[PDB]
C-alpha cells in the first residue's frame, strides 16, 4: 500500500477504538529486518506446486504480493479449520521461528 504511516491508515476517517491484518505487517517488518532476504507466477506457482501447503508458504507469497485462493488453496484452508489455523500458526511458534521459516521459503525461490 504505502511505506509509511503518517496521517494514519485512513486519513480524516472516523475509526472505532481481522487482527490478522496487523500481524501480517508485523511479520513483514521482521522479514524486512532480515536484509539479505514475469518471474511472479514462475516463483509463485513454484511455491505451491509440490502440493504440500503450509501456512508459512501463504505468508511467503504475500511478501511477493504486498511487496488463486479459491482455485488451489481453499480446500486446504477449510481442512485447516479456516483462518483459525493461520492465527494459531503465529501462536504455537516463535515470532523469530515463523519469520526465519518464511524467509527460508523465499530464499529457495
Amino acid at each position, epitope marked *: *500500500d*504505502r*511505506a*509509511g504511516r*503518517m*496521517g*494514519g491508515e485512513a*486519513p*480524516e*476517517l472516523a*475509526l472505532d477504538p481481522k487482527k490478522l491484518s496487523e500481524s501480517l505487517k508485523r511479520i513483514g517488518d521482521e522479514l524486512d529486518s532480515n536484509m539479505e532476504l514475469e518471474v511472479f507466477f514462475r516463483v509463485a506457482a513454484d511455491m505451491f506446486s509440490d502440493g504440500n501447503f503450509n501456512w508459512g508458504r501463504v505468508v511467503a507469497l504475500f511478501y511477493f504480493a504486498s511487496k488463486f485462493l479459491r482455485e488451489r488453496l481453499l480446500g486446504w484452508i477449510q481442512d485447516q479449520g479456516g483462518w483459525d489455523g493461520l492465527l494459531s500458526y503465529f501462536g504455537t511458534g516463535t515470532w523469530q521461528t515463523v519469520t526465519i521459516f518464511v524467509a527460508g521459503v523465499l530464499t529457495a525461490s
Partner: antibody
Amino acid sequence: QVQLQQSGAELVKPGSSVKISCKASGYTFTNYDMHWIKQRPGSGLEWIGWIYPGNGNTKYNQKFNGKATLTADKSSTTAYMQLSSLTSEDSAVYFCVREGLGITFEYWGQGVKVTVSS
Amino acid sequence: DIQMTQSPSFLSASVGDRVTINCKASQNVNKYLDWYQQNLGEPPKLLIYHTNSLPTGIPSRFSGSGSGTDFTLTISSLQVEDVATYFCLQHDSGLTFGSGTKLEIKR
C-alpha cells in the same frame, strides 16, 4: 547523507500551472513515502499530500484535491508536484519532505518560492 | 480535520532559561505529535517526534511530553541558536500543524 534537492519555476502568471521537482539522493528512493508541504503567511504550514514511489500511490489533503498532482519516477529518483490554475493565494514556499522509518519528517528539500503575478 | 492550538504565539526568554511551548489537539492523536524548529530561509528541522523521541544529532536539552490531547515541548536551558519559530504537527489522522511560536531573546 540523504539530500532532497528541489527545483521549479518561481514566477508564474495567474491561471497557468507550474511543476516542482524534488530530486532525492543518498537512499533507496522506493522505500520511503514523500510528502509535500506548503508554507505561506496567514495560512501557515499545510500538508498537501504524499506519494509512495514504490507503487505511485498517492493521498491528498482534501483542500488540495485537484490543485496538486503528485508523481514519482523511480529511474531519476525524483518526485514531482504539479500545481494547476494558479491564483495569488498559491504564492507560497513548497517543500518536499521524506517520511522516515520509525521516524517522521527528518529530511527536507530546501523549498521553492512560487510567486503568482501579472 | 484535527485542529491544533499552539501557545503562546510569541515567547521572550534569556540564555539559560527553561522554556516550554504548549500544543492542544481538538481530539486525541495518541503519541503521533512532532515538534519542528525553523530559521528564516530554511526548511523546518525535526526536534522531537512521537511526543518525546529525540532524532539523532538533536541536543538533549530538548524534550517533549504529552497525554494524547495536551502536549509540551521543553528546552531545559535556552541557547542562542534556539532562537527561531517552533511548530507542532499531529499525524495521527491526516496532518495538521500548529500556527507557530516565535521565540525571541530578551534584553
